[PDB]
A paper describes a structure:
We replaced 140 residues from the predicted disordered N-terminus of [name] with a maltose-binding protein (MBP) tag (SV2AEM). We tested the function of SV2AEM by measuring the competition between unlabeled compounds and 3H-UCB-J. SV2AEM exhibited binding responses to levetiracetam, UCB-J, and padsevonil comparable to those of wild-type [name], indicating that the construct modification does not impair drug binding. We reconstituted purified SV2AEM protein into saposin nanoparticles and formed complexes with an MBP-specific DARPin30 to further increase the particle size for cryo-EM. We determined the structure of SV2AEM in the absence of ligands at 2.8 Å resolution. The transmembrane core and three short intracellular helices (ICH0–2) were well resolved. In contrast, the luminal domain was discernible in the 2D classification and unsharpened map, but lacked high-resolution features, likely due to its intrinsic flexibility. A central cavity lies at the interface between the N- and C-domains and is exposed to the luminal side of the synaptic vesicle, indicating that [name] adopts a lumen-open conformation in the apo state, consistent with previous reports. However, we were unable to observe interpretable density for UCB1244283 in our cryo-EM reconstructions, and [name] exhibited an apo conformation. This suggests that the allosteric site is not well formed in the unliganded [name], leading to low affinity for UCB1244283; orthosteric ligand binding induces formation of the allosteric site, resulting in increased affinity.
The [name] ([name]), a member of the major facilitator superfamily (MFS), is a key target for antiseizure medications and a biomarker for synaptic density imaging. [name] is expressed in nearly all neurons, and mass spectrometry studies show that it is one of the most abundant membrane proteins in synaptic vesicles, with 5–12 copies present in each vesicle, indicating a function relevant to neurotransmission. Although its endogenous substrate and transport function remain elusive, [name] is a target for clinical antiseizure drugs such as levetiracetam and brivaracetam. The transmembrane core adopts the canonical MFS fold, consisting of 12 transmembrane (TM) helices organized into two six-helix bundles, referred to as the N-domain and C-domain, connected by an intracellular segment that forms a long helix (ICH3).
Author numbering: 139 to 401, 415 to 482, 595 to 742
Write the structure that this text describes.
């Protein structure tokens, strides 16, 4: 009773304070700073897929090992998403993002030099664990600096760094891997081929992300929700002063005076760990309370269905391209095709960012899901590699709008004291669906071209149906 009233008052006052601060230099600097973390998350998905064909002959892989290297990144991202999303509600957004990026960068650096298959798999697993928490923490962290006026557009513009990271990965694979002449020996005991240089170069975005992130302040909403008034006041005054100084009005004074707020060594560390686990578990369970159970279940359905369909069909596409190429042949390309498939997403990002607030999150989500379903139904008519590439571009362009709308909706539908926990849980569910869909859609190749299409169409139709029952979030303060 009392706590809900106090949190609603805090939300209203925080909206008023952010409207006083305005949107300007500070928020765009933070946008570009967190774009580096999103870009690292984008690159991680492509690294192993690009390097596997060259690693198979250096580490002597069986096919099952290649598949397990295919699935390790998603497993690690699931675990890391849940872990870091849960922790970010207790330790803070900035600190947990720093720890996540540090783990990711360290183990990505290690994976470039380790020799055996098992150690490389372990290093990639831990790199995925590290970077798994980037999207839940980044989106909430950035949202906690945004007023409601253009919140949807500002959050939608954040999704374009993932595409930029995909482009970076494709370009660097194009530029580095083919050049086998770059290979050398790191001592006479070990040879060091170019794909390891590619693996190393894919770690730079996260290092730059750490460097840029160290300069930014912690989210003031976290401090206010944790009873730390003075720190939140200093952070908000920094925001206001930066915005006004950049706008040519340094004479303005931050008028806020008081903000509502809510309130042996190894043995001590054990107590700390148990208490942190208890609090994270409490947040996770409260995500399923009577106030949010329906929202949580509908979001689980939407996330799982669309992730499963998208990842399964995006793995199915290259397999069909290979099959048609082989059928024709029996009578740079990989990187270039990946680059085209990545650039096919840009129009979707632009349109979704420009229409998110004009037509709302629900219409975006449902219409994009419907278009994805019909573009899936179209895939039965493919007849050539160029046709399959074109349909892949169509599907990828139409689904990224669904993804952006889902991200914004997930940000807006949960309270600040559970936002990262819920986002991490749903993203781990997304990665679990990715694993399951990749496996199932891999099982179908060569046997039929109808079953995976029917699966994806049904899943996307179910997701579109669920997208219409979620509530509107425009015109509401950031709860």
């Amino acid at each position: 009773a009392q706590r809900r009233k106090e949190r609603e008052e805090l939300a209203q006052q925080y909206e008023a304070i952010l409207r006083e601060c305005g949107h300007g230099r500070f928020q765009w600097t933070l946008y570009f700073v967190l774009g580096l973390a999103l870009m690292a998350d984008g690159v991680e998905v492509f690294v192993v897929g690009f390097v596997l064909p060259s690693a198979e002959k250096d580490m002597c892989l069986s096919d099952s090992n290649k598949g397990m290297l295919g699935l390790i990144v998603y497993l690690g991202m699931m675990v890391g998403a849940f872990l870091w999303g849960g922790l970010a509600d207790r330790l803070g957004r900035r600190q947990c993002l720093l720890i996540s990026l540090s783990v990711n960068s360290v183990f990505a650096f290690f994976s470039s030099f380790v020799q055996g298959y098992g150690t490389f798999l372990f290093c990639r697993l831990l790199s995925g664990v590290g970077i798994g928490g980037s999207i839940p923490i980044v989106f909430s962290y950035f949202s906690e600096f945004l007023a409601q006026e253009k919140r949807g557009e500002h959050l939608s513009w954040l999704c374009m760094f993932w595409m930029i990271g995909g482009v970076y990965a494709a370009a660097m694979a194009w530029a580095i891997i083919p050049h086998y002449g770059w290979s050398f020996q790191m001592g006479s005991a070990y040879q060091f081929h170019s794909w390891r240089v590619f693996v190393l170069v894919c770690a730079f975005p996260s290092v730059f992300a750490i460097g840029a992130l160290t300069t930014q302040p912690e989210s003031p909403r976290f401090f206010l929700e944790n009873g730390k008034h003075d720190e939140a006041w200093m952070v908000l005054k920094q925001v206001h002063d930066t915005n006004m100084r950049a706008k040519g009005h340094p004479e303005r004074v931050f008028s806020v005076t008081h903000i509502k707020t809510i309130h042996t060594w190894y043995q001590r560390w054990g107590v700390r760990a148990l208490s942190l686990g208890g609090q994270v578990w409490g947040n996770f369970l409260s995500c399923f309370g009577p106030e949010y159970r329906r929202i949580t279940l509908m979001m689980m359905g939407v996330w799982f269905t669309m992730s499963f369909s998208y990842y399964g069909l995006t793995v199915w596409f290259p397999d069909m391209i290979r099959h048609l190429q082989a059928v024709d042949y029996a009578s740079y390309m990989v990187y270039f095709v990946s680059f085209l498939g990545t650039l096919a997403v840009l129009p979707g990002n632009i349109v979704s960012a420009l229409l998110m607030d004009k037509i709302g999150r629900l219409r975006m989500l449902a219409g994009s899901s419907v278009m994805s379903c019909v573009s899936c139904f179209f895939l039965s008519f493919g007849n050539s590699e160029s046709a399959m590439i074109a349909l892949l571009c169509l599907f990828g362009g139409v689904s990224i709008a669904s993804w952006n709308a889902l991200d914004v909706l997930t940000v807006e539908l949960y309270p600040s004291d559970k936002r990262t926990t819920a986002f991490g849980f749903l993203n781990a569910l997304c990665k679990l669906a990715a694993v399951l869909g990749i496996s199932i859609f891999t099982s179908f190749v060569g046997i039929t071209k109808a079953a995976p299409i029917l699966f994806a169409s049904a899943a996307l139709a179910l997701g579109s149906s669920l997208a219409l029952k979620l509530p509107e979030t425009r015109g509401q303060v950031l709860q």
